[model samples]
Target chain A: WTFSSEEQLARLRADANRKFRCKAVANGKVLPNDPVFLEPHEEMTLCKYYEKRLLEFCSVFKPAMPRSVVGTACMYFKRFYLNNSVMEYHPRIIMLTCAFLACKVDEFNVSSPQFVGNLRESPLGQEKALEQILEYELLLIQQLNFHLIVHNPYRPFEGFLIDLKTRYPILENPEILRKTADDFLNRIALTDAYLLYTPSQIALTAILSSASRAGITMESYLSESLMLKENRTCLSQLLDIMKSMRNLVKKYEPPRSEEVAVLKQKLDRCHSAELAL
Target chain B: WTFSSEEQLARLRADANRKFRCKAVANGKVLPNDPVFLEPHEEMTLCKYYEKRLLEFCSVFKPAMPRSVVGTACMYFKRFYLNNSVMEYHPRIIMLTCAFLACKVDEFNVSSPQFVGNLRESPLGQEKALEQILEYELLLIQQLNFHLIVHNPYRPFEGFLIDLKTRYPILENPEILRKTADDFLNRIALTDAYLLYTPSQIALTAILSSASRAGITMESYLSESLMLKENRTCLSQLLDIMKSMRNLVKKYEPPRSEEVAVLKQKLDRCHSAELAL
Candidate 1:
């Protein structure tokens, strides 16, 4: 069962019982099951809800940095909340910490001191800003279990296209293949295929699916290609990946109404703030 | 100066020319005028691109599994690519490897043998399938630098919201606040914010910004409640965070046309393959 289902409640209860018994197994102090572990709604609330907050903040401060940094920061923030909750900390401090970390991770070269210094120059005080970030950082690390591998799909897409080119000599222009692959990937992203498959498989499947959609026939071209046998294996694997992806697409549901309503309200509020500014 | 800029190129050349007399360092190995340390595109390509690829793959394969596994797999794939590149390896193999990893990581409780067994049932041979994943795994780990921190944003978002409620009595019904924050975060994920920020800051900024945009007049309420005085530092920090967030929004840009075009071509080619099936 998905963590969002009734089984989660049972799992939480089991966790609580296990914690009660396991207290003596470690420090002899009972560690509470994280509230996030108990409640599923918290996941949706933090990721989508906080995003609205970011939009509003961006509408106002307008810091001089790339949008990529902002996007990275938001993604990090969402990931953090999946394992945490609002009762243990404040979101404001968490938001800034995310931005600071994202900048560093993305190699934007924006130092924390510089980021804080800029904020100090803004409407906020130095002491307050520093304290919040420091506190938030400590809690974030603990909750995240220090696992920081964030895999993205772009590289995998590139890998798949390159493989495809090698398999099919008719696709002579690497640049053209790259451009077309990107467009197909974008369309696939709009569906739930991403949530179900691995990155590389997604890339391969996307390339093959897009090729078919574009009326490119691998079978016909296979006879003319010397690497057809090797390509066949690649194509078969790609098909399996596509099958998994397609299954996911068939099962996808739109974002929940509650999620949408909250998002809409947040957007409305941000819109109002922009008008006021 | 930005990594790709001409200014950076000139500076690197001067440093290399002065420091290294060796031919490799001074000439072909490390071109002085060439930009070697150019910053990577600071975009959240893994998740977005993976999602796109997954969808495209699904259109063909039509697997019979839960979508949550896909989500988990996509996350794994994206995280794997965080430190790797497509130019050095293939994406299809990476995608399948991620799916295999996700099945294990997400506790779908499927053994690697079982996973491989299922894939072998398809047109691809077992040895080839296993070989693909085995090769990809080495490259993936190398690229990721073996760091794995999978933090979701839900937990922290809830923590901040609850904290807000405790601090301010008038801050009733955190449900609305939670929803708003969630929506804000989801949208932000589509941008570079996820790569450039920490989770806590993302959560707080999203919440505060959402409130401000909603015209909730939190300042007046805080001042009257006396909680504002106690939490003044937190409030100020939040404000500054909002300011920085606004800056990111203004700087936000969609993916480059050339890059997008390259991806599109690959997708089209992949799609054509599906038609033959």
Candidate 2:
């Protein structure tokens, strides 16, 4: 229900002023008039790097954090950077804080120590990590504007699968679509699909993608089962929207190691120079 | 998991500074130094009156709002007043706003128009109500300190019944305890038990109270079923805690109609004088 429209996110990015800026003017980098900070795409790639880490971190978490919690944390991470640059606040701490807050917000029942213990650190190291997380927790929520309720696509995906089995009998077996459908949702978690489409739309796209990969055509299911046969224009628009989401997911590329190394150094230089000023 | 310790709540009430104050120095009431504001008890009574209203309003709501949403709204209303006086912000609007936010926070999926339509007002009047609910939504969350997730006792109560059926063969019928246990929880929802105890504790107390009223002694269930026979100190403390919770629920008094009338007039006068200032 709280999904941001494309225009709303565009407005948020504009306010973030994420364009490259030469903040290390006197200390290092290009000339006075030249651009030197990480480009918008560069900042996004770095954010993506940490987003993947959050997913992995949640995977091995003891007691097994639910997919909803992980999805909510990843959404929080992305939403935070929409209005904040990686230079101003490093992603490492923010990513951990996001997971920490997500666990509490979703009522996953993990204590603070138990949460940080998931990290491969000594007791003191875990304590320090918790301290940093507690320190940044308020800032993270403030940046999110206190919209803590996240409606993830997981539930809707399951609902779609159930509906497919109940109404679309031609599928022969709907269970086969689950594996690839889940992977689609996991991959789509890394893209901007949430900001651009509803959870129901994203979930349906995942199902359709799964069906397409299995050499199955769900057009009849869409038209007859979904009652889309009477609404030609709506069906056409839905197909186009799903294509856009699928393309966005397909185009997602993890940050290159070389690009990440260079950008991480540049980002550190920008922050260090700003702190001195 | 987020239940406030009694001490933490006491600290919150102290910070509210819920003492009588003469804000109507120039307009009306006693001398400038004389006590004139609503007493903390009076504020609480007034709040209780509207909390009842919120419950009734939610009961008649179309699509039937869940009990969890109702409980969450009631909790939000109580938590908001822990640091606020009803004189400063009238409970009428605040109560509606609490329900509005609870629906969104709990993902109840009611549309904005559909929500306000529950009121006995014209379409235009409902639209105005929606505007006011939207206006106070942010203030409600701020007063809650961004702690949006509330752990209600309903689930824990069900878990206890299940455990009783499975493990406590001495009890002839676990189902018989459900009606009385449910009533105990409903009554406890109106008390400060949540501020002092965990959900599990509250749920167990409800079951215990139900058993007592049914002329059943569950000493064996407590000792053998719960493995409390090995820990005398813990069993004693648990009985004490359960007794304390039971007393709190038993002592809860709904505000009298006569008292509510007088306090409502006083509350309106206070707000009016403050607005004139």
Model 2 Cα lDDT, one tens digit per residue, A60-164: 999789988998899899889888878767888899989987887787877666788899998767756765664466568778888888988898788889888
Q: Is the docking of candidate 2 incorrect, acceptable, medium or high quality?
A: incorrect
lDDT by residue (B113-143, candidate 1, tens digit) is: 4455555255336435654554354345434
Candidate 1 lDDT, A251-277, residue by residue in tens: 544456576565445434433332211
Q: What is the CAPRI rating of model 1's predicted complex?
A: incorrect
Those runs of model 1 whose alpha carbons end farther than 4 Å from true positions after fitting are: A1-42, A45-79, A86-96, A113-122, A125-132, A165-197, A213-238, A247-277, B1-277
**What C-alpha lDDT, on a 0 to 100 scale, does residue A235 get in candidate 1?**
52
The RMSD of every model to the true structure, in order and in angstroms, is 26.8, 27.2
In the predicted model 2, the residue pairs found to clash are none
* TM-score for chain B of all predictions: 0.53, 0.86
CA lDDT of A245 in candidate 2? 88
Q: Give lDDT per model, in order.
A: 0.50, 0.77
Give candidate 2 regions above 4 Å deviation: A1-11, A14-36, A169-173, A228-233, A274-277, B1-277
Please report the candidate that would top lDDT against the real structure: 2
Which window of 10 residues has the lowest lDDT sum in candidate 2 chain A?
A17-26
